[PDB]
Amino acid sequence: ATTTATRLTGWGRTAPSVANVLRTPDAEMIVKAVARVAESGGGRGAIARGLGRSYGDNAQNGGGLVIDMTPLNTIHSIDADTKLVDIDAGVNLDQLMKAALPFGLWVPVLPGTRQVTVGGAIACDIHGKNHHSAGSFGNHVRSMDLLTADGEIRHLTPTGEDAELFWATVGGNGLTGIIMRATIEMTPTSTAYFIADGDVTASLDETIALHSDGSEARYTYSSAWFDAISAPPKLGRAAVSRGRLATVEQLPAKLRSEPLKFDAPQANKYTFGPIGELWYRKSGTYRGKVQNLTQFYGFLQYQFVIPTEAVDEFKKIIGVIQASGHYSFLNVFKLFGPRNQAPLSFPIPGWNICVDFPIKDGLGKFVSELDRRVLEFGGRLYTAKDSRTTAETFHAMYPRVDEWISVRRKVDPLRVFASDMARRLELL
Ligand SMILES: Cc1cc2nc3c(=O)[nH]c(=O)nc-3n(C[C@H](O)[C@H](O)[C@H](O)COP(=O)(O)OP(=O)(O)OC[C@H]3O[C@@H](n4cnc5c(N)ncnc54)[C@H](O)[C@@H]3O)c2cc1C
Ligand SMILES: *N(O)c1cc(C(F)(F)F)cc2c(=O)nc(N3CCN(CC4CCCCC4)CC3)sc12
């Protein structure tokens, strides 16, 4: 059960702060470290940390305590009939995926890396390319055990009398206490494969029409790479990949007797002319391609969603980005579906995009301009990717914030739980 003053950052490796980190596999010692912060209560307080994949400052606490939950990584049970897994909060999604597959069960929401803990997937209420059909990760949690500031472990359910604290802890960025353990309901599957259709669009307008014509209703998973650099009309052209979990009949014969296996890793004169355009189109257009899951897996990361109805507003912000002087090559676009009841949950239905800007003069100020425009158009930023926006902005993007903050003040009156993000965004 060691303790180390550590200089910590998020994945973005910005805004370092030093904390004492507790790393221990012993649950009892975590309860005690908490009571310990509470008795002197509460100085700089404490926050859980999972694997450190959020890009900003939610899993750091400058001059306070950070409890590394990764050692608490026990899988208690998996059951193919009830579809439930019961696991410690430090278990990660890659470990869970691998452990659940032989039961014909699939992690119901996967983000773009599986090096995330169950505790961080709940705390950021993460989403994946199936958001429009599955919701976000908080939708699939049937119970959790929350170590609260008074040292009790509350067992929370999404419809019990403890439903308000449950729903504050989904998306709550660890600020209601330390999730110790959870029960997640899994998606049944007969294979570890996808069958997928690709399409390429020529412009933002076409990208939007493809997402609005109803074709999305055929696919449980959908996302696209998106050009945010080309001037119009090329601006907003995309490479769209959509699909569903394959059934065993859909696998080729070769793959059929091991359907539930994860596989192991690991002309230029035409390129810019019309023959290159044709080739790119043909090559991103395909139907029913079978692919294993293992197939899929300095900079300011920026992600926002704009409500579905605000479509011209969304095209405007894309136009603003392209005209801005800041170039993002790696852009992921998708259309989110219905939101959940967590007050601080990020996903709303509408047009989500992740963009990644090279850090260079003028970007801070430009991104503050983006914040204003995302706000004014009904949208928000995602805490898992932020270490810069202001409290005023954040509070206006999230209109249920005061409701959440009153839940938090009930469960943690003395501020035992605190983080750099909590202080910057005035979530205490
Ligand atoms: C390459 C990359 C791709 C990504 N893609 C996506 C994506 O597609 N969709 C998406 O939604 N996100 C995505 N993310 C973000 C990532 O899913 C989230 O930031 C996830 O929360 C991080 O998990 P973690 O265990 O590392 O948590 P950490 O970053 O260590 O902590 C983040 C938050 O969770 C809290 N937390 C962690 N464990 C606990 C616990 N046991 N109890 C209470 N609170 C806890 C922390 O206090 C902090 O507020 C991506 C990140 C990377 C680096
Ligand atoms: N936005 O970042 C985003 C959104 C979504 C969606 F909303 F569609 F679910 C999915 C999503 C994702 O599945 N993966 C992402 N990343 C993993 C792959 N990336 C490429 C790497 C490799 C090169 C260098 C760093 C980036 C980007 C992040 S993001 C994402």
From Swiss-Prot:
Q: Which residues form the FAD-binding PCMH-type domain?
A: 14-189
Give UniProt keywords alphabetically: Antibiotic resistance, Cell wall biogenesis/degradation, FAD, Flavoprotein, Oxidoreductase, Periplasm
Q: What is the effect of changing C354 to A/S/T?
A: Confers resistance to BTZ043 and PBTZ169. Decreases M.tuberculosis cytotoxicity in macrophages. Does not affect binding affinity of the substrate to the enzyme, and only slightly affects catalytic efficiency
Provide the effect of C354G: In strain: NTB9; BTZ043-resistant
Q: Does the keyword Transcription apply?
A: no
Q: What is its EC number?
A: 1.1.98.3
Pathway note: Cell wall biogenesis; cell wall polysaccharide biosynthesis
Positions of disulphide bridges: none
Tell me what controls its activity. Answer: Is inhibited by 8-nitro-benzothiazinones (BTZs) such as BTZ043 and PBTZ169; BTZs are a new class of antimycobacterial agents that kill M.tuberculosis in vitro, ex vivo, and in mouse models of tuberculosis. Is also inhibited by dinitrobenzamide derivatives (DNBs), which thus block formation of both cell-wall lipoarabinomannan and arabinogalactan via inhibition of decaprenyl-phospho-arabinose (DPA) synthesis; DNBs show high activity against intracellular growth of M.tuberculosis inside macrophages, including extensively drug resistant (XDR) strains.
Q: Which InterPro entries match?
A: ALO_C, FAD-bd_PCMH, FAD-bd_PCMH-like_sf, FAD-bd_PCMH_sub2, FAD_lactone_oxidase-like, Oxid_FAD_bind_N
Q: What class of enzyme is it?
A: oxidoreductase
Q: Which positions in this protein are listed as binding FAD?
A: 48-58, 112, 117-120, 124-127, 179, 382
Gene Ontology molecular function terms on file: D-arabinono-1,4-lactone oxidase activity; FAD binding; oxidoreductase activity
A GO biological process held by the record: capsule polysaccharide biosynthetic process
The reply on keyword Zinc is no
UniProt lists the family membership as follows:
Belongs to the DprE1 family.
Q: How does it assemble?
A: Monomer. Although forming apparent dimer in crystals, DprE1 does not dimerize appreciably in solution. Interacts with DprE2 to form an epimerase complex.
Spell out the note in the miscellaneous section: Was identified as a high-confidence drug target.
Q: Which PANTHER family match?
A: D-ARABINONO-1,4-LACTONE OXIDASE, L-GULONOLACTONE OXIDASE
The protein's role, per its UniProt record: Component of the DprE1-DprE2 complex that catalyzes the 2-step epimerization of decaprenyl-phospho-ribose (DPR) to decaprenyl-phospho-arabinose (DPA), a key precursor that serves as the arabinose donor required for the synthesis of cell-wall arabinans. DprE1 catalyzes the first step of epimerization, namely FAD-dependent oxidation of the C2' hydroxyl of DPR to yield the keto intermediate decaprenyl-phospho-2'-keto-D-arabinose (DPX).
Protein name per UniProt: Decaprenylphosphoryl-beta-D-ribose oxidase
Q: Which organism is it from?
A: Mycobacterium tuberculosis (strain ATCC 25618 / H37Rv)
What gene name is listed for this protein?
dprE1
